[PDB]
């Protein structure tokens, strides 16, 4: 279920990964798990399409991945082509604190599915999380994380 009426541009800036979710434990568990990402930048292209700016721990060191993701018909669905994933879903944002996605492969979302909550300042909003635990509600997750502002402010 997403948002309509997604105004791509008003979601340009930095945003922190407050709380992510996964339909399967191991795409989550551990740093490493693959899809364990954390959203530096949203990056609206002036053509309606997004870059998404993200951290990943690799060996050692906290990288940075670049995603382009492109827009489709509906404003809140893109594609993209990154981390055996093939979808980007907005589900819902306010613009100024919160913004609530996640990605999938259209293909087998059972085995896909990773929610993130975004913030734009490091600190942890309650009602953000709130509406993340409801969109999440109907969603088949089997792992949930939570962040606090310590782990927030430090890269990955």
Known sequence: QTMKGLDIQKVAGTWYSLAMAASDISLLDAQSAPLRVYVEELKPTPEGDLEILLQKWENGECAQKKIIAEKTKIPAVFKIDALNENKVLVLD????????????????????????????????????????????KALPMHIRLSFNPTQLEEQC
Request: proline share 5%; hydrophobic share 35%; net charge negative.
């Open 93 to 136: 944002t306010d613009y100024k604190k919160y913004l609530l996605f996640c990605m999938e492969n259209s293909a087998e979302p059972e085995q896909s599915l990773v929610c993130q909550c975004l913030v734009r300042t490091p600190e942890v909003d309650d009602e953000a999380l709130e509406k993340f635990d409801k969109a999440l």
